[PDB]
Amino acid sequence: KALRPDMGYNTLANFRIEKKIGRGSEVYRAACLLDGVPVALKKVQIFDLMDAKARADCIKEIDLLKQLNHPNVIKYYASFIEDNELNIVLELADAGDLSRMIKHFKKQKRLIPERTVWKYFVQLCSALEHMHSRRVMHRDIKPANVFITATGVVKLGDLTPYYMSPERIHENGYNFKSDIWSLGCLLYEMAALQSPFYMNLYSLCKKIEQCDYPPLPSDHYSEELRQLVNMCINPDPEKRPDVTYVYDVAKRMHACTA
Ligand code: NI
């Protein structure tokens, strides 16, 4: 339809869809016509798959997400109902992700150097500390959801889970410490090019309660990095550190490995 300038990013009429870039919700690359800014436009059929209650929860959650504002977190520009669908307008992160980065290293048959691990991990910690400071849980930390722009800037992405924390396996509540568990698994994965517990939930539970994951090599990864992983993936959420402590370690290690 026709441009509605008063409406900012809150109406489909102010965007030109350029391409479908994802599906399964459907995701389009679009441009905001008011300012030429590129966006990801996600269309969710919340009336064909969502209960009255889940709809309010999902919406209240998106409203909390829109208040976020950080260079390392994907910006939620807007969300609105139109054409009987939920439309979420997101910062476009198009150039790649941590999952792809790890694949490059696997293909070149080499490990990610420690300094490179901290270079990206510290930015991820910055994102997550912003979120936790705003009292928002991420809930889906995984390499494919950690975008990396073309200039190597980390963008923590929009919210059978990739990393299953013990409390989630047994259907306890997801909380801030569950984010820390995924963050620890991710750090391990950057260093090992494989998830720590790479099956079924019962054998997964067994391995977790017995730290049955292969140690990282001490000749490539410092005690600092290895201990930080170890504490973040403690089975007991009370034993895991808060994001503020993880972030502080990341910043110290980034500063002296560079
Ligand atoms: Ni169990």
Numbering used by the authors: 20 to 43, 46 to 180, 199 to 237, 241 to 300
What's the publication's text?
Nek2, Nek6, Nek7, and Nek9 are NIMA-related kinases essential for proper mitotic progression. We determined the atomic structure of Nek7 and discovered an autoinhibited conformation that suggests a regulatory mechanism not previously described in kinases. Additionally, Nek2 adopts the same conformation when bound to a drug-like molecule. In both structures, a tyrosine side chain points into the active site, interacts with the activation loop, and blocks the αC helix.
We crystallized the apo-form, full-length (35 kDa) human Nek7 protein and determined the structure to 2.1 Å. The protein structures exhibit the canonical bilobal fold and are virtually identical. Residues 20–300 were modeled, with the exception of the disordered activation loop (residues 181–198) and a small loop (residues 237–240). The overall conformation is that of an inactive kinase with the αC helix, DLG motif, and activation loop displaced from the usual configuration observed in active enzymes. The most striking feature of the structure is the position of Tyr97, which juts from between β4 and αC into the active site of Nek7 and forms an H-bond between its hydroxyl and the backbone amide of Leu180 within the DLG motif. The DLG motif is in an inactive conformation, perhaps held by this H-bond. The aromatic ring of Tyr97 is sandwiched between the gatekeeper residue Leu111 and Leu86. In the Nek7 structure, αC is positioned outwards and twisted away so that the salt bridge between Lys63 and Glu82 cannot form. The N-terminal extension to the catalytic domain of Nek7 (NTE, residues 20–33) adopts a highly unusual structure, an extended ordered loop wrapped around the side chain of Asn33. Therefore, the conformational change required to move from the Tyr-down to the Tyr-up conformation in Nek7 is more substantial than just the rotation of the Tyr side chain and would require a concerted set of movements around β4 and αC.
